[PDB]
Amino acid sequence: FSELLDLVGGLGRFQVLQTMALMVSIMWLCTQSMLENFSAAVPSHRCWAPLLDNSTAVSTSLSPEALLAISIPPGPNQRPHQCRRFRQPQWQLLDPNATATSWSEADTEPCVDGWVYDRSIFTSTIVAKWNLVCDSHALKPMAQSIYLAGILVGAAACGPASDRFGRRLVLTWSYLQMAVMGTAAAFAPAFPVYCLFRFLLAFAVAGVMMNTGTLLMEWTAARARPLVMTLNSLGFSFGHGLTAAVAYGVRDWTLLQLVVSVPFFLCFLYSWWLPESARWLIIKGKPDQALQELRKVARINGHKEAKNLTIEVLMSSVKEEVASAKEPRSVLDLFCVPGLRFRTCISTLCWFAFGFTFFGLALDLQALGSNIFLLQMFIGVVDIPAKMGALLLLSHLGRRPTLAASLLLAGLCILANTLVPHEMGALRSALAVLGLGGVGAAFTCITIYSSELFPTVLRMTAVGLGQMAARGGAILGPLVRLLGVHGPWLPLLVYGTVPVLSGLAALLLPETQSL
């Protein structure tokens, strides 16, 4: 089949343009996934109070800070209580002689009149719009979990649909669905509706993710395939800096969601100029259309040998690919074959740890440091060198030590975050960034390692099981943030322990580097 592509041009103008387009689309998709750091940022809040907020009331000479002392009780975090207010104004606290014994918990009431939010950084967020605070604090991580479950279901549906209808058609409708559901979510009137539309948007995101990579492989000669996979991975790295810049420019959540959704109407449009995969068309029994597509691409590449191709050449040569359908395998087959039991268990655990840790940490940057725009930028800045150095080490020192060291380093960097003093926000930010870079390198290492652990027919099923395990773990990722009620150290402790244990499992895998 590669010789046909060399009769069409296995790496030329067409592949360059296609790669550029799909890289850009992946950048915007990454912005879609990371958006809720800025769309659902939690501004500081307090109950609405008659004295503080009703400017129409009788004015007084007291300073704003004195009124804040008079109205809102002190909270655990050495700050105003974010969910309670005094039943009656506590004038007695105004004198410096006041003591905590002067007021009882019975003298505080939960916010009846709602909350007042800080607008200095963000003009509006879904948290401020729908009051996802206090009793409703669980609703933000629940929304993120619903988005990731949408990704899981979309990935499940993409395979059968992609085989029945083709890569390009599914990619086109995935683009359209992403644009429509991102625009619908921006104007949602209520929180449940917002969750529904985010779920369907993730449903489309999964199809874009899968079909972009699949369709890039099948039009590229084998001598350039790994480079294309690397560039596809780097598009995600650039998506973080894109998110940082766009969110820095746009401080309003509706406009931000709209801005990151509009680009996919253009992606939908240029998807119509993309040719469908020739392998799929021939295997489906459509040689004429496949020949049309191949002559199309050869014309794009300015390649003369379009004169030579005929349907007889296509059918006779690719017949061996058409014959490939004869040997299916199940997930149950992986677990039944004695020796693959161990490899499957540990590999699945590593995939699960990657997804769990990355999407647990990356979606609450507001806890990891001071400035979230710079954190979002810097995880993208670190991801690139991390992944390419991971490739260098993986070609030098083998799969097993590199994967183990990457996961262990990520775990140790995240665990240290729980031990460092809070005053050193800079050091904490650096450690968090390094941990996420380590997780990205582990993603690279496992992506390559999985294809080598298993025999050829089971290779694809094993990779599918791993990816599905990662998508399932990402769902549990955000929910662990609910444990933060007992202190922010516990979510980070979980996020840190998991990669450590999965790295210590990586040491037990068998090596595959040829020596």
Ligand X SMILES: *[C@@H]1O[C@H](CO)[C@@H](O)[C@H](O)[C@H]1NC(C)=O
Residues lying near ligand X in the complex (CB under 6 A): 54, 56-57
By Cβ distance, which residue is nearest to ligand X?
54
C-beta closer to ligand X: residue 64 or 328: 64
C-beta closer to ligand X: residue 56 or 97: 56
For the record, the structure tokens of 302 come out as 């300015």
Bridge partners of residue 80, in order along the sequence = 74
Closest separation in Å from C-beta 133 to ligand X: 19
Say how many C-beta atoms besides its own lie within 10 A of residue 456's C-beta.
8
Element at 108 (helix H, strand E)? strand 108-110
Closest separation in Å from C-beta 71 to ligand X: 14
For the record, the structure tokens of 431 come out as 């450690």
Closest separation in Å from C-beta 56 to ligand X: 5
- Judge contact between 380 and 475, C-beta under 8 A: no
Exposure string over 355-383, b if 16+ CB within 10 A, otherwise e: bbbbbbbbbbbebbbeebbbbbbbbbbbb
Closest separation in Å from C-beta 131 to ligand X: 16
C-beta closer to ligand X: residue 57 or 424: 57
Breaks (C-N over 2.5 A) in the chain follow: none
CA distance 397 to 515: 11
Question: Which SS3 state, helix, strand or coil, does residue 47 take?
Answer: strand
C-beta closer to ligand X: residue 54 or 102: 54
C-beta closer to ligand X: residue 50 or 385: 50
Closest separation in Å from C-beta 253 to ligand X: 25
C-beta closer to ligand X: residue 57 or 457: 57
- Judge contact between 438 and 357, C-beta under 8 A: no
Contacts of 362 (CB under 8 A, 6+ apart): 34, 37, 379, 436
C-beta closer to ligand X: residue 68 or 384: 68
Closest separation in Å from C-beta 113 to ligand X: 7
Closest separation in Å from C-beta 52 to ligand X: 11
CA distance 73 to 105: 10
Which sign does the torsion angle of CA 43, 45, 48, 49 carry? negative
